[PDB]
Amino acid sequence: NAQAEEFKKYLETNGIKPKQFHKKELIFNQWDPQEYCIFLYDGITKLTSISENGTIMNLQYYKGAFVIMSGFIDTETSVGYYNLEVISEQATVYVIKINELKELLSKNLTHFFYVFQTLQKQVSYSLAKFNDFSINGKLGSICGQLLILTYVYGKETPDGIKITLDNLTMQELGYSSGIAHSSAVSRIISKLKQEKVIVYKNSCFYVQNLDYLKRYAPKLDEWFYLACPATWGKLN
Amino acid sequence: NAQAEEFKKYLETNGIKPKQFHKKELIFNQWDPQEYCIFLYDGITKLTSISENGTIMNLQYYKGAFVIMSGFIDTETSVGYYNLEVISEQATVYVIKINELKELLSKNLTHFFYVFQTLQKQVSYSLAKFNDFSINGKLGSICGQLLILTYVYGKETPDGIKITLDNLTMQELGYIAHSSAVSRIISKLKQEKVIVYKNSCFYVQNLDYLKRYAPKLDEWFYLACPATWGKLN
Ligand code: NA
Ligand code: NA
Ligand code: NA
């Protein structure tokens, strides 16, 4: 990712050093009024909101390289009461107080535009997820998350396209698909195994009918085509 | 909206003339190879998509002043096969090809920040909507839509918060097109006197009910539009 590598160099040039966070840590949290720009260089995170009774809502997932901003660039105040939780074993992030970010994007407009484009990717991703759910419901949701994982992490094996993630849990897959309880995920994962679309072997999902996933997540497939054409092309 | 007025003046300063569109016209469409930045100065629009059947899906609504970009700012290519359709009688828009937007935002970072912040508001809005649907389902979505009409178009009166939007437009925004499930939810809120018809107008009489079932969109409006939130709270 050439833009992300150039942005990394720009940050280090300007004294911003990488930080390692481990699984379950909150890079930023919903109770902290100091807001941040997070450059997630490596690893997997999720945006959450925690209710007063302790229920955790999973709102969005991100993988490095990406940018997540907890405050508005102009007002420096919260864009929502959100946490950014590490779900990979480790994540590498560059943390920039929001008051400092304006200065930096101001002096290099190439990187201003790299960060702008990431917001556009979020917005359109959310719309595509909404569109697929409206058409195909929870099946579309789960098919879409399996599809993106296949594009990003898939490896061709004799067993199918293996999604090469450690501890890709049934529960985390449902959360990324907007489904909060395991009953609905089991029923759909059951149908997908029954119809021989996926298989579960060495703690990993293998995709054996990629066309089926594309069929039921058409707007997320189109999002990936439009936003990540080189990666989309590996399996089309 | 002071920031938006400054942006309008900056566009005109750089030679960009407003265009007028009418209800049901497309400001941009999903088939055009060229992408645009739309400064929607006045009016109401919706983002639409089409499945293979020819079925139209309503994805998002925008009211002036706002910024809608159909392509990525760096690559200038589509962010999605989307159309932008006018819902009000008329809309006033400024249309900027994406390559020219970058030159404009480069030269005045105040305006760069304005467009960047509007994109941040859009991102958080989508997440708030998703959070409220995930908690309260279609009731959360509908209460959220009604909550935004109340905050954006509402004025306090002795009969409640009058929605100061023409009745034609206001029925559309309350809501794929014309879901029976949505109609039943809306008419249940009316039946329960959350929103009431009186002397040719509609009045929100139970704002607390809307806030209860769209709590994340309520927080979004407090954080993103605090002065508009404050008027009615
Ligand atoms: Na925070
Ligand atoms: Na277009
Ligand atoms: Na107030």
Author numbering:
A (entry chain B): 2 to 237
B (entry chain A): 2 to 176, 180 to 237
The authors write:
Glutathione binding stabilizes the DNA-binding helix-turn-helix (HTH) motif in a conformation compatible with DNA-binding, thereby allowing expression of PrfA-regulated virulence factors.
In addition, we found three new PrfA mutants in the remaining three strains—Leu to His substitution at residue 140 (PrfAL140H), Ala to Gly substitution at residue 218 (PrfAA218G), and Ala to Val substitution at residue 94 (PrfAA94V). All the previously identified PrfA* mutants, i.e., PrfAG145S, PrfAG145C, and PrfAL140F, could grow in this medium with G-6-P, as could the PrfA mutants PrfAL140H and PrfAA218G, whereas the strain carrying the PrfAA94V mutation was unable to grow. The results were consistent with the fosfomycin sensitivity test—all the prfA mutant strains showed significantly increased hpt expression compared to the wild-type strain, with the A94V substitution having a minute increase in hpt expression. Hence, the new mutant structures display features characteristic of both the inactive and active forms of PrfA. The PrfAA94V protein also had one folded HTH and one unfolded (WT) motif identical to that of the PrfA* mutants. The most striking structural difference between the inactive, intermediate-active, and fully active structures is the position of their recognition helices. When superimposed on monomer B, the recognition helix in monomer A is shifted up to 6 Å.
